[PDB]
Design a protein around this ligand. Structure first.
Ligand code: MG
Length: 520
DNA sequence: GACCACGGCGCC
DNA sequence: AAGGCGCCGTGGTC
């Protein structure tokens, strides 16, 4: 089938990177397949200019690499997206190939022919799946182009500020470490939970409460240590040591070393086929779990800044999952609460209760994750459902359907297969139930945010603004100072009106020089 | 160098 | 708020 480069327009592309991150990868090889032919590019970088779109497996990644090189090469069809819609457990090329009629190799030509062949089969599987096709055409496929922009754009980071902060935190860690070592009566590796275990529960003879899941060792987690916060001063130091080292090792130290030499910015990856619910994920590095709660966490978030002459615009959906719950269940009362613009919670304290049913929390975990009366905690949970009968009925209906079909679905029909709903082991069955009825909620919220990104992106391009980050129910944009206000106002409207529900969606928006101040 | 499992923990 | 994730250091292996 081998023919000379270039391929005819519309061909399926195959490509090989030196490493998984497209912003950092060397393009080792490039090929394309179509009409019973395969075309291999003599020089991949040059040949990249001959393509009009990236059609094939991992299309977005190639598109990002093209953007890095200053080329406009939007991602198109991608068999990975079709398979992910069919079954969100389809997360890798390896598995999708083996499942739908091929083998994922390390040769571009074969990857091109594979892309073509797999697209043929998958597109066949999606016939009759009207709603899955809608998600593909209206959400996933167009979203892939938005994600490519975000990845290639990156976000600015105050490196010098983080470098200075590292030295400050290092000294405080030293202070905690030396103190812990004194109390232990000896020095040990504080980073080793095994060594720590022995020191706390054997040597210091402190009470061992819970056990680890897989190996049944005596846990040293924060939930456990919290309880011993008064039973020994060493516990206090250990918990402070944990926060500082976690944030230093995970964010403060690594991030500055990841600045791209061409862009001068930090670039993450937004993985589009990585979760069981339809959410995006972020990696290399993960920019969806940057610290925000503690004082030191806030210091770190301040390092994410706007380019000179620009401002960050931060938009957050308010309680989107609860609003989705109101819609899906059709519960009159819950719906009323939002319609009348009242704070559902008043309708961390009583909030744990309201945000509690979204995953069926343990009535016992209410006296712990909220410190209540325990026995009396499992007594108010009935009133919750007494006032929201349609919610219980919805949960019940969801599970019943999940058992019969073998899957649950979001408002738009995104599916997740949950096979353990009839497991004969209680703990397993019940864990499965929690996954099952959470996904229509978390998944619908993901569908909505994705659709909002798809609608918003073209509007931002028109205004010379950029989309930088998504954090599940949040967006961070970057706009020129003279257009920031207009951008903020427009984005809010797009997000709030993405897909009208039985209840309004509300969005909080802020503008600032950095990620933290942009909220306040 | 590389991979993995685990406990642990950061965010939504 | 913390079902859904990704990264850390440790500990073990090849
Ligand atoms: Mg794990």
């Amino acid at each position: 089938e081998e023919a000379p480069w270039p391929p005819p327009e519309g061909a399926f592309v195959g490509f090989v990177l030196s490493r998984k991150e497209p912003m950092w990868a060397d393009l080792l090889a490039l090929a394309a397949a179509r009409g019973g032919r395969v075309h291999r590019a003599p020089e991949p970088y040059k040949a990249l200019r001959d393509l009009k779109e990236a059609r094939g497996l991992l299309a977005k990644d190639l598109s990002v690499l093209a953007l890095r090189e200053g080329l406009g090469l939007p991602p198109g069809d991608d068999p990975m997206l079709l398979a992910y819609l069919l079954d969100p457990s389809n997360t890798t090329p390896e598995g999708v190939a083996r499942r739908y009629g091929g083998e994922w190799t390390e040769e571009a030509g074969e990857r091109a022919a594979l892309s073509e062949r797999l697209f043929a089969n998958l597109w066949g599987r999606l016939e009759g799946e009207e709603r899955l096709l809608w998600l593909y055409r209206e959400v996933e496929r167009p979203l892939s182009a938005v994600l490519a922009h975000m990845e290639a754009t990156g976000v600015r980071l105050d490196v010098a500020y983080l470098r200075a902060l590292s030295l400050e935190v290092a000294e405080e860690i030293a202070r905690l470490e030396a103190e812990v070592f004194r109390l232990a009566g000896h020095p040990f590796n504080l980073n080793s939970r095994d060594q720590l275990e022995r020191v706390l529960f054997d040597e210091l003879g402190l009470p061992a409460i819970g056990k680890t899941e897989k190996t049944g060792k005596r846990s040293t987690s924060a939930a456990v240590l919290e309880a011993l916060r008064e039973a020994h001063p060493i516990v206090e130091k250990i918990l402070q040591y944990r926060e500082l080292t976690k944030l230093k090792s995970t964010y403060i130290d690594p991030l500055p070393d990841l600045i791209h030499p061409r862009t001068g910015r930090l670039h993450t990856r937004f993985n589009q086929t990585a979760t069981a619910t339809g959410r995006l994920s972020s990696s290399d590095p993960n920019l969806q779990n940057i610290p925000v709660r503690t004082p030191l966490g806030q210091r770190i978030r301040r390092a994410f800044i706007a380019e000179e002459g620009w401002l960050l615009v931060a938009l957050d959906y308010s309680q989107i999952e609860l609003r989705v719950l109101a819609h899906l269940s059709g519960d009159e009362n819950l719906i009323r609460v939002f319609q009348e613009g009242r704070d559902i919670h008043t309708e961390r304290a009583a909030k744990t209760i309201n945000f509690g049913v979204l995953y069926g929390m343990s009535a016992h975990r209410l006296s712990q994750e909220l410190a209540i009366p325990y026995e009396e905690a499992q007594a108010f949970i009935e009133r919750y459902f007494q006032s929201f009968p349609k919610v219980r009925a919805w949960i019940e209906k969801t599970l019943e359907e999940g058992r019969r079909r073998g899957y649950v679905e979001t408002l738009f029909g995104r599916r997740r297969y949950v096979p353990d709903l009839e497991a004969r082991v209680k703990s397993v069955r019940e864990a499965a139930e929690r996954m099952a009825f959470n996904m229509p909620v978390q998944g619908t919220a993901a569908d909505l945010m994705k659709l909002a990104m798809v609608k918003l992106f073209p509007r931002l391009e028109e205004m010379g603004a950029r989309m930088l980050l998504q954090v599940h129910d949040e967006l961070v944009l970057e706009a020129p100072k003279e257009r920031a206000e207009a951008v903020a106002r427009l984005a809010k409207e797009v997000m709030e009106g993405v897909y009208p529900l039985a209840v309004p969606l509300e969005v909080e928006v802020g503008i600032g020089e950095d990620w933290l101040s942009a909220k306040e």
